[PDB]
Symmetry: C2
Subunit: 98 residues, 2 copies
């Protein structure tokens, strides 16, 4: 299965909504892991792309989202339908309708 790694800022409705959306996606069987600069700081140094991103964009450029190690979004969180697309999950399995 694909894995989404989410590199969050140290720390609003966007965050609340993203937490809700992660819950729907995980329960559809999907792999999502989160890391933030306050609680998992070494993860941001040990991942080559994350370290490069912080250097180029600044920490202010977070969040950074990697899908199987590949950048898929940077600077905002995905809507639930965007998560569904990345993982190939039907909308009706994550509480969404077209």
């Amino acid at each position: 299965m694909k894995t989404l790694m989410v590199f969050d800022p140290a720390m609003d409705q966007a965050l609340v909504d993203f937490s809700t959306d992660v819950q729907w996606l995980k329960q559809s069987g999907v792999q999502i892991e989160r890391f933030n600069l306050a609680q998992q700081p070494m993860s941001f140094v040990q991942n080559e792309k994350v370290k490069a991103f912080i250097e180029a964009s600044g920490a202010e450029g977070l969040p950074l989202l990697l899908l199987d190690g590949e950048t898929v979004m940077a600077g905002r969180y995905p809507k639930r339908a965007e998560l569904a697309r990345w993982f190939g999950i039907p909308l009706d399995k994550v509480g969404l309708a077209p």
Copy 2:
């Protein structure tokens, strides 16, 4: 000065265009590419090619600063651009 490459999809757009003009008048090098007009740029740049494969074209825009990804999925605000290019705060 760092250079900016913007890979666009085929009000945020309007504001961004204004900000691009501001940066251009300041001397910043900015190049834009889209799938309707410059689609082969999207396969020739390996970071863009990989991004489209991973995220989908729906994941655009992708912004590269000296060739490094700095934002993907939305456009930057003027204050973010100022951070990237080291544009100092105005006094008073």
